[PDB]
Amino acid sequence: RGCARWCPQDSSCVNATACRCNPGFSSFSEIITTPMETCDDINECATSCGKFSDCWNTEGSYDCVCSPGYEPVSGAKTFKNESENTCQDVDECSSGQHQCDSSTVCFNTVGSYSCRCGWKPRHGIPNNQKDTVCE
Numbered sequence: 298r299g300c301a302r303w304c305p306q307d308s309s310c311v312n313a314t315a316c317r318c319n320p321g322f323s324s325f326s327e328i329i330t331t332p333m334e335t336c337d338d339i340n341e342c343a344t345s346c347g348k349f350s351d352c353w354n355t356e357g358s359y360d361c362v363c364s365p366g367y368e369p370v371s372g373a374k375t376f377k378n379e380s381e382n383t384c385q386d387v388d389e390c391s392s393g394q395h396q397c398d399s400s401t402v403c404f405n406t407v408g409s410y411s412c413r414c415g416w417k418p419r420h421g422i423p424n425n426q427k428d429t430v431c432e
């Protein structure tokens with residue numbers, strides 16, 4: 298029809314006297330009729346990303362990301378649903394991404410990894426940690 302100029306932030310005019318919140322935002326009434334009404338972000342993460350991932354809420358949207366220690370086989374850094382999830386554990390030992398001391402051997406774990414000592418751990422540092430150092 299027409300277009301109200303006074304639509305509040307994150308809403309768009311539906312005609313000359315009304316607005317509606319943009320996708321990802323919500324207001325008490327389905328149709329806004331005054332500029333005093335607000336369009337608040339909807340936290341989609343509080344309403345499934347799938348295995349080994351995390352939901353991060355953003356303004357107007359949200360993103361699923363592989364959790365730390367996992368990376369997407371498909372390569373897509375962000376995704377929207379379980380169906381697009383390609384998160385697999387990162388084998389830090391095979392990839393040489395680990396930061397183990399030359400005195401230990403990298404041992405892969407799901408979501409992480411550790412370093413094991415023949416040798417014995419130096420004083421004050423346990424065995425089987427990322428910072429393990431032996432002698």
Ligand SMILES: C[As](C)(=O)[O-]
Pocket residue numbers: 346347348349350351352364
């Ligand atoms: C950290 As999760 C796999 O429950 O989105």
Ligand SMILES: [Cl-]
Pocket residue numbers: 320321322338339340341355356357358359
């Ligand atoms: Cl949203």
Ligand SMILES: [Sr+2]
Pocket residue numbers: 321338339340341354355356357358359
């Ligand atoms: Sr949101």
Ligand SMILES: [Sr+2]
Pocket residue numbers: 366386387388389405406407408409410
């Ligand atoms: Sr790992």
